[model samples]
Target: RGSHMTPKDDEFYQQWQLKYPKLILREASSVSEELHKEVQEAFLTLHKHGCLFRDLVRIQGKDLLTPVSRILIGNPGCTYKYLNTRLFTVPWPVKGAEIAAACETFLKLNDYLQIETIQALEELAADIKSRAAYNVTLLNFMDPQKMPYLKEEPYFGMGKMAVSWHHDENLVDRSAVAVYSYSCEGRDPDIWHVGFKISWDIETPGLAIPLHQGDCYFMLDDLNATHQHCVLAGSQPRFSSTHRVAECSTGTLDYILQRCQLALQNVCDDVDNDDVSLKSFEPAVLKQGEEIHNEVEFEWLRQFWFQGNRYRKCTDWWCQPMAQLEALWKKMEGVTNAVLHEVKREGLPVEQRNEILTAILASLTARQNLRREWHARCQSRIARTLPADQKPECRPYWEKDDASMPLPFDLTDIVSELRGQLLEA
Candidate 1:
């Protein structure tokens, strides 16, 4: 299917070839060596003005785990949402403007290469031919021993630091890549970073790589969608500047670039004054390392997980009986009817009725999609984990993700009945 890709192109291409799960150019030294080296050397300068910890929203019944030391630099109003952390942009410290500029150049070209040919596959590519600026740069620095930071706040260099595995969720919705440029001073091979999926099983033919200077790891949009990433704890130290592109108009982009340029100057001026009086920020509360939280946006994710349970029953033909599905549907339909009936009793106008119907359909469709994706993940997990002999027989319509199969329920019929019930009276 990838007839357009040559051996060289395919060489960089990695697993889940359906839409190019991911691609990495080991030592993608697009950034000038001098600028790369300059930023690498400037890494220590951040210590004078300490880095910003990722912001947190406390989730009920959970404590948020604090990862390594990081400060985010992005254009004003150019916020970044990565996993449980929703980081606001702080202006760049001038010390690394040249590095940021070089990175900007590299990302523009890299962004083009990423979607160049894939436009044939991705209709969204044509919408924005120009790649926007890498507004958010998360600067992560590690000391001699690997440790994150203190929940009590602003403490570093106890030789305890690490970042757990998770996707840079900021780029999940938008089509963008995370460009990571890693550098180490007291170099040791123990430092590790990974791009992996459940299907890989961390075994043969899996996706994992080491971090090194001049190394640019590209987490393409699809890779971020289907896979996850991490910075494991290490014996030696590792440092990096990871950048993510954002959505903005050509004019907005210019404004962002202009602002970043000046911000760089500000940082540079501070450093020139030998001002390591690093500006620091703290969340409302600093959670312990064992804290597992940041679910303030739980409702947004709750429906997706709620829909996932049904797919597990679809492992085979007889695994999930229609009787059981009917029972489940009864409970689901009960709540929907309750809402619809309330609206009906209120005697809201037709427009309001239609609006309610529209919203109802939208939520239902989203849940279906959630279930569908869960099945796809299950399909992937099954194929990777199970031996061929033990793999469930999933013939096309029964299990093929793309195959046309009968939906468990007749949503169209339900809509018609509701419309009839409302419109008749």
Candidate 2:
């Protein structure tokens, strides 16, 4: 919804040339060859440990696909988020030392932590250190033979390409962007090139910078906003780690934590149970209740487990919020199952047992719907009033995302039983 003033002919490049003034490229040979090797090895260590994951984008109505293989490693809760989803931040306990050391090296390379720059900026440098020190680091791995996302066609005879032309979106305004490249042994060292073009015109001649093994480049000031860049692919295995300052916001994180606590309060308990009698139940109430139950379970499947075939088992302290939420959902399901078993064993009348089950379903659905409404409010605020370039726009829910497998048993089966009982004539 935002617009940029288009530039034409030689004026476009000349305009950027003046604004940027310099192109900073640090070749591995120029810098310490040893540092490059160390950074490369650190990336390989993370690759071997299953820390990196492919990024998923929703296609049509619950169906999704991996468009890129990348991961973020940086300050806690400061990773890049675009569209409606975000990259999974590398778990806290998984090789914390290695990630921290690697990040330190990257900051030094980018001149963010350099003593000279710190002395020059003074107060501004202190603000950078206090607020956003290495805010987010994104590592993108590419193997022409392995990753199916890379295409074979060349872009302007550059090579097989992966990334298309687009400006990096939703980052801190005017912050520097830097990338360090690495190539594995026995792989083509010259397979990666970053092509830059004027934002509005693709037909004009643009600059294509070759980034070989251990090569690093940076764009400071307004270069990223004025020009678009793409990755032109070649053969062999290569990966690049990009360091950028991302906006720090915790609105969504706090919302999820609060929602988890509220759901726990709605857990089914026999003591002082708010059971509804058969006389109070109407056909419309049962129908509406069933609809609400399905809605909640569907969302539960997507959030807790990635597309809901199995549960996410967490072991680290940072993942405590998600772990607690998972525990609460399981508690709800287990309690409901036990209640159903007790009624079956006691030989209670079908009508009486059905009434009791409906009451439980009603309570759970109430909290779940409340949780849903609160989430909608958060999303609406993001879309309506936030800066056009600061936060991502929210997409309509029904248009995308689907599970590769059926919903987990706890999510779907218990609700099915409740539906069966509630439909009684």
Candidate 3:
């Protein structure tokens, strides 16, 4: 049993409130200049509709102790406590005015951000190269033999643009370039053969920190992973800026691609004798000895398998009432077969084919487990990832009513009539 608060207990609460008064006042000031003003406005707005105390009871509580208890207990139903914590606190109307001023200032600032044409970017790149040359010469003076020789060649190459595939195991390290473009007529060029061209749209103000040209925002060697720059839309020929990495004797770029290809080949060989009952057979396996040289084909195949499994898991989660799990499984099989056919047409290698099949098997196992867990009833079980905080609650439209009023007619009757009409038509 709890005892009633004595004079000492009352004084303790008063002292606590006084100690935090400044913090409370500062928070309240955010809503308006005078706390009493906002409170009076709110009270007037609610009182005019005979809802001042009624709404307070509904939102807060009869004694105000319920909301306080909720806050102390750290329960989910603390929205009212949260509102009370901000009551008369935020400068809402003043903030709205400041927002308008900020927007006007932003519009005026945009007027100065004209797009730098391709020619202007080229000049900027040249300036960076000239500065780089001076830095290189100064460094060479200290240890001429130890310093690597700097090539005197121009950065941008003048030639017909080429289109070729690039594959590398170490592309992860080079994934920092926000934008890049290159052109070669036939063969793919190495890092040393061409300058890396990167650009940003001037209209986009927040893309780069400090937002300035010739910033050396990222290094050329770091943007190899997952970033493949396509030619600009329409008939505009691809542009280039002159600058290339100083050449090294090790042929590091080619070595990286070769290592990636070998790793993929090993993965395929390891899975060669595994089960194939769940997977469709590719016709490429029937060929005698035409070896698969491309690793990108396998990369695409792995992505396809991963996507299919992900879709299957989502469908099972959403279609729980129908229990159409078998249908979903069949659809996934068909999708896998179609993708395999496409890979075959692309002439992917046997090793790559095996690696992709292994990935598909792993994906299928994971999706199956996910579906099973979703259907199982257990109080303590939690999902791998929590649902988003803002996800809307589901409510059947028929369940909502202002009062317990009788329906005009039965909903089932309307549904049956519609079904009969469809049969007649």
Candidate 4:
């Protein structure tokens, strides 16, 4: 039981304030010890693989660290975008099969997901089953000494010192968020706390909820949309795994798949031909020619293709020259520059050189256009405010959404006009 302030109106919003009143805290003793052991084991395995990383974020022109080490375990394009940090896919550990088995055990078998609550209602169950079961799970690990620490004060707290308060952004609209927290410390006094507040008000002394080891909570329906939350510093080590149904618009998924296909097509030669085809790399869940309709297919496909044995020699996904597409783009840039110079100096006429330069410019601009559009769509989707209800303070503590990274300048219209002119000529 906690502060239960109802919203002024529910015509536009999800009426999350109403649902916030019913928020339930599930205790550790209620959960089975076996399940807890399984969850902990899975988390440790992922951590051991070097899958967890703190994102380097820029705020107010200065580079900053995320409050905790984070990783997303799910689909390739099904991302977790919060605090201007966008995580895409889970990197494969050395034993990929073990990782897969662990993921299945954690996601499929665990009762912490509250599947009974979801299946209790007909419409909710149908809606969830139609899409995918919790597409993205965010793993946030807090080691007080290693990360930016913010202590919980008597009343007022300020800044992005640690786990700053904010709404969970870019989730499937109106869907629920289930969070299961685990603490490594055997004792209770050193554990961290979660804070909640309404309206993002500075004047208010928000409620703080302490999560002991194996404690769980759910933010169902409109609760996430209408409220903000943060993690307060503690002496102990802990991690929270937040399961959410992410916003998986077909446009985003298709673009990512197209990029993957392009890379596989261009990058593979006779030497690497053995394991390059999509069919060979496709997951068991999806049949040939069947489009990936949900998160499961996307995650499975990503794990089998992008994070599989073929790419084992590559570095982590965060490192460049590692992801399949980036490597292809890197090679393309190198080769294009070579051709641009060689064609001009190898006795090419003035008109011919001019043609080559213009063509190169167009190609480069087109690639930029694709990339910019994708980024714009993604940022737009993850925005905290409703599309029609934009405001300056929509994001937590940040005024302009673009302050972290400015949106790409669009020249698609100009490029389109050039295309017409060139075709006529």
Q: What ranges in model 1 sit over 4 Å off? A: 1-21, 28-30, 54-60, 83-85, 92-133, 144-161, 172-174, 185-189, 198-205, 246-425
Clashes of each: 13, 6, 17, 1
> Residue 195, candidate 4: how far off, in angstroms?
1.0
- In the range 160-184, model 3's lDDT, one tens digit per residue, is 2222112222222322121112211
Quote the lDDT for 252 in model 2: 34
For model 4, residues 252-332, the per-residue Cα lDDT tens digits are 444655644543343335553223322121222121112212122223232223222322322244334235433443333
TM-score of 1: 0.42
Model 3 regions lying over 4 Å from their true place: 1-25, 33-334, 340-353, 377-425
Between prediction 3 and prediction 4, which has the larger lDDT?
4
Question: Candidate 2 residues 1-425, lDDT tens each?
Answer: 22111123345456446533434566777667666667777777766754555543332423233434666665543335554345434433223466556545554554532332233235333453432234567888878777656554233444456676777766767666677777655113255777666668645555556677877777555668887777766666888888766764532345444544444344434443333122223334433433333333333323323311111211132366445544444444444444556445666777777766666666544544544543454355323443322232221132224332222332345555667777878
Candidate numbers sorted by TM-score from highest down: 4, 2, 1, 3
Per-candidate TM-scores read 0.42, 0.55, 0.17, 0.56
Q: All candidates: CA RMSD in angstroms? A: 21.8, 12.2, 30.2, 13.3
Q: TM-score for model 3?
A: 0.17
Scored by lDDT, model 1 comes in at 0.41
What digit string (tens of lDDT, one per residue) describes model 1 on residues 249-300? 3213233334333323212223222122211111111111001111111221
lDDT scores of the candidates, listed in order: 0.41, 0.51, 0.23, 0.51
In model 2, residue pairs whose N, Cα or C atoms come closer than 3 Å (at least 3 residues apart or on different chains), thus clashing, are 61-400, 62-400, 62-401, 62-402, 63-401, 63-402
